[PDB]
Amino acid sequence: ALKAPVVVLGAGLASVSFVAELRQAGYQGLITVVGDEAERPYDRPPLSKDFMAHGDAEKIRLDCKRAPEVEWLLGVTAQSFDPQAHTVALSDGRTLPYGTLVLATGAAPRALPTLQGATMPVHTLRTLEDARRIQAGLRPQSRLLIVGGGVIGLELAATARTAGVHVSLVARGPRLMSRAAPATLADFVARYHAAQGVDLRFERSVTGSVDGVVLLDDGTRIAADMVVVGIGVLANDALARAAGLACDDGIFVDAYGRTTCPDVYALGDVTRQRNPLSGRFERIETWSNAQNQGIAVARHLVDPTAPGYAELPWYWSDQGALRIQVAGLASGDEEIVRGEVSLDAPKFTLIELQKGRIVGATCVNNARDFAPLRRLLAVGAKPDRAALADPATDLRKLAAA
């Protein structure tokens, strides 16, 4: 079952979390991790946040201390694996044997086809190298165009505005954060960014570019010194596809992290997995999934009596003055708004319900509300909805009860 030696492909958060849990759970056999980036393993959320603003990579490294006795092959690419021979072929000419192989290769930013032949700077923001490259170009009074309405681009937008950079943003949909964000939140977030000077263009797509100017599908133009594309990511599932595993922009796994190939597991951004709230398979793209799924899969490998991965989804985003936290589903049949939604000292909570049952929650500048709401969400609580609205109500009391 858990057969030594263990080989993990990828050295991001999912991998680090997985190998630390293997050790903590008591597995003492060989663990080897192959990571294509020549970087001490590091966390990505700071890259569009404090790192983009302050530049110290030694504040963003992951703690591999809870993972003793691991050989990390950094700067090495796994090129293929042979699931019959139980081997992995590496870019440096070496081959690793495995008893258990774990694919934790993450995802990469989607390229924008219309900007393929561009003769102006066009970047994406995924790696430390990407962040350093973008940061090197955030000159005060320069012009940045962000393509896409997702959180990472909005975090970059806020960071750029704080740095004195002019920011325009083009999104193909009618709202920001179309993925897993309640409309009420998305609308407020647009109002916030507009108030901070972001030039927002909804329902537009990029059709191309000429001599430093980006073209839009309404026949207009946006001049910029740099474009940062953030229209989503694609799973890094090429090795899985070539080896015959079931994949579709993501490696399909069950709650034990098993792929369709025996002795091969997958974790984190590279996986397509069940969302227990929707009951549908989705590629979850969050820090909490990478950590939590890695831990759960490791725990169950060492102790097969342990339950499978069962945590419900959530994420956060830091956009200037907005500390955003979102859990569960973006919508149900009812939204309750706790507090006022205002640009004057923003602070509010949203609760999404389905037939009286909490299926999601949002907190903006209210971390204290978020933890008990996630607990109510996890048990599918059906609380009094006037109480949920009632600003008197203490949610922590509710959660403990």
Ligand X SMILES: Cc1cc2nc3c(=O)[nH]c(=O)nc-3n(C[C@H](O)[C@H](O)[C@H](O)COP(=O)(O)OP(=O)(O)OC[C@H]3O[C@@H](n4cnc5c(N)ncnc54)[C@H](O)[C@@H]3O)c2cc1C
Q: Which residues are near its own copies by CB under 8 A?
A: 244-246, 248, 252-256, 258-262, 273-274, 279-281, 308
Measured between alpha carbons, how far is 105 from 93 in angstroms, rounded to an integer? 20
Among residue numbers 192 through 231, which ones bind ligand X (CB under 6 A)? none
Task: Label the pairing between strands 166-171 and 334-338.
Answer: unpaired
Q: Report the residue number, 9 or 298, with the smaller CB distance to ligand X.
A: 9
CB 214 within 8 A of CB 119: no
Q: Report the residue number, 200 or 239, with the smaller CB distance to ligand X.
A: 239
Residue 248 touches which of ligand X, its own copies, none (Cβ within 5-8 Å per kind): its own copies
**Given the rule CB under 6 A, which of 54-62, 99-107, 301-309, 322-330 is the region that contacts ligand X?**
99-107
Count of Cβ atoms closer than 10 Å to residue 57 Cβ: 15
Q: Report the residue number, 83 or 182, with the smaller CB distance to its own copies.
A: 83
Count of Cβ atoms closer than 10 Å to residue 111 Cβ: 13
Phi, psi dihedrals of residue 396, rounded to the nearest 5°: -65, -40
Range 246-271 burial, b when 16+ CB lie within 10 A, else e: ebeebbbbebebbbebebbbbbbbbb
| 3-class DSSP assignment, residue 108 | strand
372: CB partners within 8 A, 6+ apart:
395, 396, 398, 399
Instruction: Give me 174's structure tokens.
Output: 């009618």
Query: Least CB distance from residue 296 to ligand X, whole Å?
Result: 14
Name the nearest CA neighbour of 371 among 286, 303, 310, 314: 314
Of these, 6, 7, 12, 180, which contacts ligand X (CB under 6 A)?
12
**Given the rule CB under 6 A, which of 9-17, 132-140, 188-196, 242-250 is the region that contacts ligand X?**
9-17
Name the nearest CA neighbour of 238 among 106, 146, 62: 106
Of these, 6, 8, 10, 157, which contacts ligand X (CB under 6 A)?
10
If binding is defined by CB under 6 A, does position 106 make contact with ligand X? yes
Q: Report the residue number, 209 or 286, with the smaller CB distance to ligand X.
A: 286
Q: Report the residue number, 355 or 397, with the smaller CB distance to its own copies.
A: 355
Query: Least CB distance from residue 351 to ligand X, whole Å?
Result: 20
Q: Report the residue number, 125 or 336, with the smaller CB distance to ligand X.
A: 125
Query: Least CB distance from residue 37 to ligand X, whole Å?
Result: 5
Interacting residues toward ligand X by CB under 6 A? 9-15, 34-37, 44-45, 47-48, 77-78, 104-107, 125-126, 152, 236, 239, 268-270, 285-288, 290, 315-317
